[PDB]
Amino acid sequence: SMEQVAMELRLTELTRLLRSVLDQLQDKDPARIFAQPVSLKEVPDYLDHIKHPMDFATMRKRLEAQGYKNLHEFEEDFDLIIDNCMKYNARDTVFYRAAVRLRDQGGVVLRQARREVDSIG
Ligand code: NA
């Protein structure tokens, strides 16, 4: 149906916008601390601590499958990246601190993304 086509075009356009958001967030992580999953071969005890691991490569895989139906879903995944890091790592670490700076810088990007999603529909 044409109504189904129109819904698919909207999901595609949201995907486009979320790709640009993902690229902008990731630029805020030049150290690439959050680029890839924590390897269970190098923090063997990770999944005892963190129930829902998340990273930018995992988000990009979901995005390329048009797996985010709205901005809230995408934000949930970004908050997991930050929040998981702030639990596993102590305050005094480069990891905890990098997560704080990513959250702060990413707030800016996400604020305008919400306005654009709402405005374009
Ligand atoms: Na902690």
Residue-wise DSSP of 10-76? HHHHHHHHHHHHHHHHHHT-TT-TTSSPPPTTTSTTHHHH-SS---HHHHHHHHHTT--SSHHHHHH
Q: Kindly give the distance from the C-alpha atom of residue 112 to the centroid of ligand 1, in angstroms, as a whole number.
A: 31
Cα dihedral across residues 71, 79, 24, 36: positive or negative:
negative
Class of domain 1-121: mainly alpha
What residue type is 21 in one-letter code? Answer: V
Helix (H) / strand (E) element for 4: namely helix 2-27
Q: Kindly give the distance from the C-alpha atom of residue 91 to the centroid of ligand 1, in angstroms, as a whole number.
A: 8
Other CB atoms within 10 Å distance of the CB of residue 77 = 19
Q: In angstroms, rounded to a whole number, what is the distance separating the alpha carbons of residues 95 and 7? A: 40
Pseudo-torsion of CA 72, 74, 77, 78, nearest 10°? -100
Q: In angstroms, rounded to a whole number, what is the distance separating the alpha carbons of residues 49 and 20? A: 31
The residues near 121 (Cβ < 8 Å, ≥ 6 apart) are 10
Q: Kindly give the distance from the C-alpha atom of residue 50 to the centroid of ligand 1, in angstroms, as a whole number.
A: 11
Return the DSSP state at 95.
Answer: H
Q: Kindly give the distance from the C-alpha atom of residue 27 to the centroid of ligand 1, in angstroms, as a whole number.
A: 26
Cβ contacts of 28-33, under 8 Å, gap ≥ 24:
28/101, 28/102, 28/105, 28/106, 28/109, 29/56, 29/98, 29/102, 31/98, 33/85, 33/94, 33/95, 33/98, 33/99
Residues with a beta carbon under 5 angstroms from ion ligand 1: 87
Residue ranges of domains in the chain:
1-121
What Rg, from alpha-carbon coordinates, does the chain have? 16
Residue 9 contacts residue 17 (beta carbons within 8 Å): no
The residue assigned the tokens 């924590």 is 38
Q: Kindly give the distance from the C-alpha atom of residue 84 to the centroid of ligand 1, in angstroms, as a whole number.
A: 9
